[PDB]
């Protein structure tokens, strides 16, 4: 039986990776897939205007 508050729900991992090889194993890509485009972004709406503020890639 599924408990009302635990298995009914699922919460998101608040942040995504920042290191390159961490991304590359997160998506299992390659030594060469150019991680810069596989970046997780988070579109916010400060007002009507929006922006994504993708973090960085260290290393």
């Amino acid at each position: 039986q599924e408990l009302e508050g635990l298995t009914d729900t699922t919460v998101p991992k608040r942040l995504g990776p920042k290191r390159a090889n961490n991304i590359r194993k997160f998506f299992g890509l390659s030594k060469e897939d150019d991680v810069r485009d596989f970046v997780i972004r988070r579109e916010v709406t400060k007002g009507e205007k929006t922006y994504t503020k993708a973090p960085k890639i260290q290393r």
Partner: protein, 126 residues
């Protein structure tokens, strides 16, 4: 009614059986018999007396109580949402490892743009 434990021998004390000794440091020892009371007053150590639970623990006699624990071997089994990932589309992008020649296709346009910008800057300097 509680069943207290002997402070020297680990025996079980039933009500109305044995004695209690309050030491000057306000510690309470409980004895099931004059034997263990006397050995306490003779200030012997129960880890050296062979009939005591403490000795038997220290020497591993009747040691079938706890054996061991396992080691964890298993996956995560949850690609949970990264809160800006949209896990379904994130998996759709994870399967997008093939057809990665679009990466070089975009690198070609970036090379064209960087070279045009270099030429533009070299011309603007003049």
């Amino acid at each position: 009614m509680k069943v207290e434990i002997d402070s020297f021998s680990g025996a079980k004390i039933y009500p109305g059986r044995g004695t209690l000794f309050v030491r000057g440091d306000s510690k309470i020892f409980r004895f099931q018999n004059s034997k263990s009371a006397s050995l306490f007053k003779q200030r012997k150590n129960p880890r050296r007396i062979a009939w005591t639970v403490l000795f038997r623990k220290h020497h591993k006699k009747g040691i079938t109580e706890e054996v061991a624990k396992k080691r964890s071997r298993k996956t995560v089994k949850a690609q949970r949402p990264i809160t800006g990932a949209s896990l379904d589309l994130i998996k759709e992008r994870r399967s997008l490892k093939p057809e990665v020649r679009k990466a070089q296709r975009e690198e070609k346009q970036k090379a064209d743009k960087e070279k045009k910008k270099a030429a533009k800057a070299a011309r603007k300097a003049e």
